[PDB]
Amino acid sequence: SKLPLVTPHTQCRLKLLKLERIKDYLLMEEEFIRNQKQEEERSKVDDLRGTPMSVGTLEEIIDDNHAIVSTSVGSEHYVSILSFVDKDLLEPGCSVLLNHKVHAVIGVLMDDTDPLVTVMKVEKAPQETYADIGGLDNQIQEIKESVELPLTHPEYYEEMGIKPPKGVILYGPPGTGKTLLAKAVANQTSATFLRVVGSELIQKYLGDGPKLVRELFRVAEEHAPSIVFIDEIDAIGTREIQRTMLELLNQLDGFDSRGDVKVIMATNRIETLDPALIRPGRIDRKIEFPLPDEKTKKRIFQIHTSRMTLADDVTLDDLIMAKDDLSGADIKAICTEAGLMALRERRMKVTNEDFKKSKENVLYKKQEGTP
Amino acid sequence: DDIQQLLKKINELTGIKESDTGLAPPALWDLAADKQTLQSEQPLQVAR
Amino acid sequence: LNAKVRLLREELQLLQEQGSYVGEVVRAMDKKKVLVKVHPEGKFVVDVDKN
């Protein structure tokens, strides 16, 4: 659980009122909690599992209540299963609690292994929203139709008899908002978000690449409604690395039924992509991210400078004008550096000239080369 | 800051969340047969 | 003299108690149960005493 989002950002008493509303509610929480049976069930089960209980691994289930369990010493024991253990929650590789004296299975322990993919499960999408992105409307509708609508409303596709699209590639110059759009769609539909950065699936170990992608899809399907993001797919996209490609392509198209997990893959060099990975059967949605135009640039300037204190003299149009020379990330860079420049000369209220010299210096640092 | 500190106070007051175990629906399981088998049978080890 | 005799006697009494292991918890399992990791063996779930 998390706090509500207070949506004035200028210092106004509306922001205050929302805040003291929240304080009121949390204070009622405090009040309520401070102003303060099944011993039969406990006396049977939690006394049968006499403390302490060891933790081991389940290998096989042989009978209805008989299973093989290994422990951290590595020994193997054919033990019985007490009736209260959920059989459907038991499978090879599962962590199981065991009676200390007689090693009898006394319950399943929720998994705490596979650390790395557990970290890349992130789920920490809520920093952005479709709000934070402006002007990418065509891309927004495309990705909504491809991945967001089938997750939010698969009813349309099931009623239509349609098997939903099962792969999306995002492409364009860097800093156009591909990663931002992926995070934003992860935020709009609260399906679990999976991110893995390109080259990081390339590994020294021969198996580790395909193994890593296999376990990532395994955890994704385990979370069921999930979105997996591979940024800079080019690192793999453009024998061992080709074998990781084959693993990913078969995880996309191949045997079994994948189900609900969606795949977003972002590239900066789409034309260098190999034909196999761009599967017409799987990857039917390619979304271009062009360099922002005048309207989009204006929207990005408003979005980013919105949280900054601004003077009256700022004429945003001369910043917007000229051509499509730069992307949204460059716009954020101009906003930030204009903030610093206003800070040096001691303005907490950035002016037009600040942005003018900021864009000039950025264009100086933008590209290079002898005449 | 009161938001943050009151959140932490709520968290410490409610305590940690019960991670729990298996324990299939209560009417489904137990019987004295469970404990009788536990105290009667043998936890066999496995050997090649 | 009696103070030193008494402290030696009680120290001898506690000296019979054994090594008590060393453990590190990964996740507490609410009151009592609590999950711990001990160095040579694996994970356990160990009730806590009066503290």
Ligand SMILES: Nc1ncnc2c1ncn2[C@@H]1O[C@H](COP(=O)(O)OP(=O)(O)O)[C@@H](O)[C@H]1O
């Ligand atoms: N249309 C946009 N709206 C808002 N921010 C944008 C937009 N395009 C780019 N950005 C900024 O650029 C960064 C995202 O760059 P992005 O193109 O997603 O990286 P990558 O090329 O690695 O996918 C974000 O910090 C974001 O603030």
